[PDB]
Amino acid sequence: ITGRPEWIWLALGTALMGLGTLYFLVKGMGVSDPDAKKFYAITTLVPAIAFTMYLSMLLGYGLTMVPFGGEQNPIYWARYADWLFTTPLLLLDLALLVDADQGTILALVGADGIMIGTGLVGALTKVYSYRFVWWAISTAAMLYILYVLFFGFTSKAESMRPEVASTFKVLRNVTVVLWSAYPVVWLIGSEGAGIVPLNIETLLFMVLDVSAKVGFGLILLRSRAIFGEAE
């Protein structure tokens, strides 16, 4: 395990996701409100899935070698397995907060699936120049998602409770900033142009992942917006 310099960040990531999972699990024990239960379920599952995939990367299972540029390049494929399930759960948290219509939710989840799926294909593609074609398609799917979060959701939040409108606005802003960093790190890291070494890349993704999951969850689950308006 320690044979890879990036192991320290995989281990820290595993620990922080594990701790985040346990914290949300305990916190949600005292919850009976049916609406709050939905948000706790979604939000606890996110770091639990990430915990398993960080562990698989730490132990070496979630790593494969991909030939491109005349080299055997270490590619952590387990990231995409994580993201396939956790990024639509994160979007679902946002969509339920603002009572999004079903068509909009399906558009978001579908675009998200395309985003992660094409990122996976790009990560595993052996023809170097083609990796960036997949990156571009994935990034276009991301831009669609960000567009919807701003010009379909923000003006939906404003007709809702003030506490859900303010909580949505904060989580929207956190999401757009954090999620936009992922394609940049991929592009300059070992999957793309290879300018930033894998150990630093792994650190960067770990900070983004913990912030986008445990950070996000801490903000959401401390808000009164997750509860039905009750006396």
Add this chain to the structure above:
Amino acid sequence: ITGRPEWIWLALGTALMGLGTLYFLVKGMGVSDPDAKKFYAITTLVPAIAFTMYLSMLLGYGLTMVPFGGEQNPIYWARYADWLFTTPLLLLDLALLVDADQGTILALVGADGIMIGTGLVGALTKVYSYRFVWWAISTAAMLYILYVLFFGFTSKAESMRPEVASTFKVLRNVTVVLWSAYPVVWLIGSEGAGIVPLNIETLLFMVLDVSAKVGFGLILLRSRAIFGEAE
């Protein structure tokens, strides 16, 4: 890319799915009705997914070699990845049109999953005679789906709005004819008996795919059946 004679049909397929995706995306921009949004979301996602998988076939990612009959046989596995997601979306379009009950929808999607999954296993099976066992099981799942579309849905459409009944009937008929061709092409093509060469097989699937997705979508999204009855 041009090293494979079937590349021209993969390229045309990619282009037509891409163009179809953009057309539906633009067309649905001016839509606020919650019901119509569902149909636009579902129907736009279908060629978008197909676009990505056609591209993966064009670039060579979605192709593998399978030993059977003492030969290395080129198998485009990306078709099944496409179909796994797009065929239940197509069925969902039909089921929502007639306000199908939840049990019926689950039966359809489940049978569809079995249909595509067993087709994939058959496509990748190395014992030649066993490929046709999987083809038979998949075809039985197809026949179940077609049965339900006729003797569970058609008489559901007739108690609904005339515009939804007439639109459903047309899309049902398009679906049954087009979908029934797929097992025949598989059986006589490079996956099955090998009587029709891969380049012609690829052409045939491209015509079926564009018709079943973009053709289907053009009929559906031009109907007033996708809108709630409103003043």
Add this chain to the structure above:
Amino acid sequence: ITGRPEWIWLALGTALMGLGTLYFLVKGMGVSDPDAKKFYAITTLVPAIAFTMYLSMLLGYGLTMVPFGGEQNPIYWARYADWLFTTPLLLLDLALLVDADQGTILALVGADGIMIGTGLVGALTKVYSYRFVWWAISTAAMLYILYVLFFGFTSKAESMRPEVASTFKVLRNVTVVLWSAYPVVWLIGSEGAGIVPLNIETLLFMVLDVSAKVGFGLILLRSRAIFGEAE
């Protein structure tokens, strides 16, 4: 096929799932009640999926070799493909019976996904001692599911119809006993410590699978709890 001593149990399993599938399919033909249709759909799909995966194991497709302990160890990976889809369907049968809230259903299905997914990783892991780390995480996800079935569902059933409360209690008890055997068989069988040989392991899983699917389904589909209260 007969080259593997466990083939007889794979063949019997295939037959019993096939027969169970046909029986439930015929039985549900005379059903119009929308609630009952849901239970028939879910419950018929379960042995149908299991039939396909038992067949893939019989024909040899669903088997791979995994190096650990200095040996090539036969691992039937198709079990996890089965279980990935059938165990959440089984939980859905239980959850719908007691009209579980959406948050609880998502927690169950999510924990179940983690349970099966980590079992799959453990089954395919090449470092022997690490296989048991994945077994432990999977078992913890199982224990969560069993906890919810007892201390979240049982007291939900009691405020419902007596026929649904009594049917739920029986199916809950069947589920907890049968499902708890699976991690034990894995641990002592060819995936784990290797004390029980593969042919006996295969027998054990076949008895558990038929009981947990066809047995379970026979109890559920003969109950009046699956019908809406109607005059």
